[PDB]
Design a binder for this molecule. Structure first.
Ligand SMILES: O=C(O)CNC(=O)C(=O)O
Ligand SMILES: [Mg+2]
Ligand code: NI
Ligand SMILES: [Zn+2]
Length: 331
């Protein structure tokens, strides 16, 4: 069995290997990459996402979110307070202000220590989940707006045509902005490209050990667990590496830099934080190996997680027993 320790693998495709997205994902899996839950892909040196980032300041962040923490430094929840709209140029200036800028630090490890010691004491502002793309339309390889759609994959594998669309989303971050512990909707894959700016640190639990993370989460967040059997779908819970190590949870960590892709694999729980002003683009995708994970994915029926239009069909076809309950939570 390849990659039995479930380490995060890093890939360097050539330009020829970069031409066929599906084939390369299947290659990475042949080497055991999925066992980690996360892989890094460094594009060939001939590739670029677009020519420059000089013309992005007029993008609007309609609903910036202030991420307010509650709990203790290693075990906390965050909620999202809506703020007034601002442009990417206004957000960048805010990110670089003395109130929000990255502190002086020695290296990534020192910054990670500072994040876990100090995150809860501040409320950074995140531009999340903005529908759109920064890939040039003439970028032909690994263009996140031109991938095969999940609805087309379900049709090819299972024969059923379904409604829905699959589009990318932008993320504008600053120091301490945080993505809470989660798997993707319907335990899909994700691909994430860091277009510009400062790094993003990731934590991940191997898919084969996901239930260990869920059990610890129910212990650490006992009221949230009573409220919802799939409360990590709310995307609010943070647990530090130190706490994970104290509780014997298997995980890995890696830092993504500008110009790099990360792939998350079905049922790979992940969390992380931004080092400073940055912009990432992400989208969900599927392969034939996802289908069996999609059939088994948990679902939030409490009302909180409130998702996309296109998840309806996935629940309806893959999880018909759960459909009625899950839809009552959506309405
Ligand atoms: O960058 C983000 O805020 C978080 N990314 C992801 O959850 C992803 O691409 O799977
Ligand atoms: Mg612009
Ligand atoms: Ni994700
Ligand atoms: Zn819920």
């Amino acid at each position: 069995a390849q990659n039995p320790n479930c380490n995060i693998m890093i890939f360097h495709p050539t330009k020829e290997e970069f031409n066929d997205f599906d084939k390369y994902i299947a290659y990475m899996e042949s080497q055991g990459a999925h066992r980690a839950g996360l892989a890094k892909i460094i594009p060939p040196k001939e590739w670029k996402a677009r020519e420059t980032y000089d013309n992005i300041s007029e993008i609007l962040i309609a609903t910036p979110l202030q991420q307010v923490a509650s709990g203790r430094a290693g075990v906390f929840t965050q909620y999202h307070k809506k703020k007034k709209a601002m442009t990417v140029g206004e957000y960048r200036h805010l990110a670089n202000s003395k109130k929000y800028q990255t502190p002086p630090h020695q290296n990534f490890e020192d910054l990670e220590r500072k994040y876990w010691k100090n995150r809860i004491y501040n409320s950074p502002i995140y531009g999340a989940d903005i529908s759109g793309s920064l890939f040039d339309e003439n970028t032909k390889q690994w263009n996140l707006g031109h991938l095969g759609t999940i609805q087309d994959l379900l049709e090819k594998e299972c024969g059923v045509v379904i409604e829905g669309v699959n589009t990318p989303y932008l993320y504008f971050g600053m120091w301490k902005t945080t993505f809470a512990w989660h798997t993707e909707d319907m335990d899909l894959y994700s691909i994430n490209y860091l277009h510009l700016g400062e790094p993003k640190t990731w934590y991940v639990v191997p898919p084969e050990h996901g239930q260990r993370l869920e059990r610890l989460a129910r212990e650490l967040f006992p009221g949230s667990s009573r409220g919802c059997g799939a409360f990590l779908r709310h995307k609010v819970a943070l647990i530090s590496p130190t706490v994970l190590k104290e509780n014997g949870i298997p995980f890995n960590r890696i830092t993504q830099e500008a110009g790099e892709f990360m792939v998350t694999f079905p049922y790979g729980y992940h969390a992380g934080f931004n080092h400073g002003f940055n912009c990432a683009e992400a989208i969900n995708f599927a392969t034939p190996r996802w289908i069996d994970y999609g059939k088994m994915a948990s679902q939030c029926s409490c009302g909180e997680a409130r998702v996309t239009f296109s998840m309806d069909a996935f629940v309806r076809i893959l999880q018909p027993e759960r459909y009625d309950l899950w839809k009552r939570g959506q309405d």
